[PDB]
Amino acid sequence: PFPVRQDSPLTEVLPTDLKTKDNFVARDPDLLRLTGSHPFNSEPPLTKLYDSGFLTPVSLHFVRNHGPVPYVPDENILDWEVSIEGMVETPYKIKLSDIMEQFDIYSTPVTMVCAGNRRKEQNMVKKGAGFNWGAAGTSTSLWTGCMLGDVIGKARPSKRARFVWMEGADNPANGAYGTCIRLSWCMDPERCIMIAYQQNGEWLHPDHGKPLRVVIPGVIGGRSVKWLKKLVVSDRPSENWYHYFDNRVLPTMVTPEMAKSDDRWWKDERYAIYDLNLQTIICKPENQQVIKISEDEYEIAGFGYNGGGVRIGRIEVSLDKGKSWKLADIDYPEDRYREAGYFRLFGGLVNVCDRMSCLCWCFWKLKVPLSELARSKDILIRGMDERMMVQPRTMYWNVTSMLNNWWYRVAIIREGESLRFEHPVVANKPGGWMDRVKAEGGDILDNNWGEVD
């Protein structure tokens, strides 16, 4: 009735991982390494992400590890303990077995996305402090677990409390990875924030937080803390190093030099990222794909996602550099779950039907004549949400190069009787229109995306 998937979890640790601190972690070879062999930060290839459909296989899900994966022995897992302390009436410590036994379990489709997705495009303009991501720093899954809200609810947060700090078990360079989320979001059924212990029917792979993680829909991955150990109800935001010095969109005029040499650019919550911005990405045609000109339709296609559970109302494609726009047909598989009423899946209640929010990505398609693309220099795509907030033409360059959501552009190159298509960049190799434009010497932030007229 709606998408469901569980695959075989991988066994083979790859030679590259055998040589590394994560020597016990079986990882899909198709994932594209972005900080070398370790720590593991990866995205699937864009075509495999799209071709997988609404649900990304666990093994192709993107990984973002700031440091090494903490070793977790399966024969002890159920006793994995999490601490609920802070501005509560009744602090307590709960183990996973007791999470499972005492709280209502749900299973829920959730798009995850990294703050960094589409970062390389920023890097091509001006190299910042972050490693390249392509456009596939997103993956969608079914997550099974309880509601953070219920766990936190049980300790009786005080009236002055505003934030739930989360802290993991891992040990990145600057210590335990930790950040926070707002308390009332935890309490809001529409946001549906979980403590998850399964993903696409399987107990968590180590890269995805085994045994236990927070998953915060409509919010950057950065706030979905893996290998969860502490939850601290508080009146103010986290003071973890990783809350301050990562996952912020600093004002465009702030330079890497200014941010290195002034701590307090990082100490204003106004630049701290929670809810994602609206992104739309073109997947068909693919990077470097060639197609013979004819009188036929080609189905341009992609996906889009948004923040705060706000639905994307329209996706629009221009072949004339944004002078005119064509309305794409959007598909929202989350509505399949919504339409379907209550189900039990992987031992959890499927209750999207209780909500109106869009916690997941969606897919769009638009057929145009190959002959219309023949007369075009590019495909552009943008989305607008139900707040009538649209993606910008202009790039918002920022130090961490996060949340880069300016219109995604695929260049159309005429070659005799065919067309070749270039995406902006490939995640870990050259091969995009941006690579070309750098060789030509174009200013990518000019009004023609750095190209010649």
Next chain:
Amino acid sequence: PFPVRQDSPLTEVLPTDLKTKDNFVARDPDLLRLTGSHPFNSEPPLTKLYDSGFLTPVSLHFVRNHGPVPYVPDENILDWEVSIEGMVETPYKIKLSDIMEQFDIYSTPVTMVCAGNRRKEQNMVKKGAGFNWGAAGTSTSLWTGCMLGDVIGKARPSKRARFVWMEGADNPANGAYGTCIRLSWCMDPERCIMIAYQQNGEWLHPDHGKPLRVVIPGVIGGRSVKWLKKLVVSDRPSENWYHYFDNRVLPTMVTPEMAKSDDRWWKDERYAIYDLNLQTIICKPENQQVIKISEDEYEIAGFGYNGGGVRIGRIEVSLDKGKSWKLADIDYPEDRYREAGYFRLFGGLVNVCDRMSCLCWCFWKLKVPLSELARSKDILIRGMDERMMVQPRTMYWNVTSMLNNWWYRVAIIREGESLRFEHPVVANKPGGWMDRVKAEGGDILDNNWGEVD
């Protein structure tokens, strides 16, 4: 400790109103008529809106009446009845006196804004179906009343219910003005949706819904139904004519001719406006203001507002056509109320302190050297919210020309030793850079805002 204001309510009915169906309505002469003498749709002049500060005087508050104001005798007011029916357990009818006596009362600062604000700018490009608004289709007030949520709560909405229809007592051309809002927004303390019977300490003026109206913060005025009579809890959106055929941002490529000749462009909720988009507006320098060049700072200034209670994180000004940007200093008087804890005002609880949302506009300032403006063709301004959603460069032209939130541009005209400044348009007269550009024959949607280089 925070802004408070109550003024004398006006008595004098103006000659123009004496001649009209609204012959009993005392109206401020400084307001600018936008559909002639009647129905009354007006905005204050931009400088008076800004100069009034955080709280707009009631008399200068903007009015949007689709038709005539229903006559309400003060000596009966308390018995004004409202009907709570629909998918509830216990339908009931409550009169105002009993609203006041039985529900908790609150007093709350709320920015209102019309869907149509900044519409003329769209009209200058291509004339649509809506009457010109300038940039002052917004006003901020203290509103006193109960929570829609509590009223609706008392009837016990059913589990399948998703929407609260609202219907007024007035009789526009197509009958009772009605629309809706989502039920869970009604239940959400952060949204803080009221049934208000006072405004800046005074019982409601007739233009603002006397005796009773809904006020929905962070949402377009259109959903804040005046002269309230029915509330209908329902599983699906309103079917009022005014819900369908007003207050929608139809896809840009949809023409007035296509929308006239196809009903169903208006029957997709995805284009129905609720939460406002992010707007920033420049108020200083004013329209046509002249200033002598010197080595002095000038304080560029304005306001901004956003939807869904999402704070505006940054306001940025460019003097170089958006190549570089300067960070403005934002002031948020709503935080004054937040910081201040619990108070009683006009018989209502001031409890912004309970919330983290921004339901109100904010003010920004930026000092630049007059000599830097001297070398510029324009001031541009944009904002970005805490969802890292920024206003667009590009205009989103649409049939009703609503929610036009592309960067607001003030042209700088060099005249010997002074500078003259032109805002895009004046609400009800010529006098802007857009008027000039139309006389020159410029394409306002081109990359130089229709101007010559």
